[PDB]
């Protein structure tokens with residue numbers, strides 16, 4: 073047995089921010105679509121469309137991009153609803169960007185986030201997608217089997 077979902081969580085509203093200069097908008101979009109579809113067939117409720125299209129940003133503007141995109145996406149939502157998930161595409165070698173992302177998400181925005189490295193975006197393997205679905209599920213309050 074590989075791990076599976078016991079209870080799938082719910083991602084009704086999500087957005088993607090991209091920090092990789094090797095990744096054009098359409099690829100981030102296609103990536104997120106494949107990931108969304110994996111989470112769904114694995115047992116989640118998962119909106120096949122994001123609240124807003126992916127945006128591309130420089131690592132240097134992590135604070136500004138995250139806060140602004142959070143604000144703009146949340147504002148688009150029916151009053152009282154919140155963003156369930158941020159998918160972030162990172163350069164493979166991103167230095168302090170991961171840790172800065174996570175501090176902002178955890179302690180300022182209080183948003184669930186899932187980072188994905190450029191190398192996996194390019195490969196978009198089903199095994200990778202399945203693993204990341206599992207991580208997401210736990211993060212949004214689902215439950216997975218144990219080995």
Ligand SMILES: O=c1ccn([C@@H]2O[C@H](COP(=O)(O)O)[C@@H](O)[C@H]2O)c(=O)[nH]1
Nearest residue numbers: 162164166170171185186187188189207
């Ligand atoms: O200091 C770190 C820690 C993790 N990663 C990457 O982020 C991913 C997972 O992100 P997340 O599940 O913590 O959101 C990985 O596949 C991992 O290699 C980094 O780029 N920097």
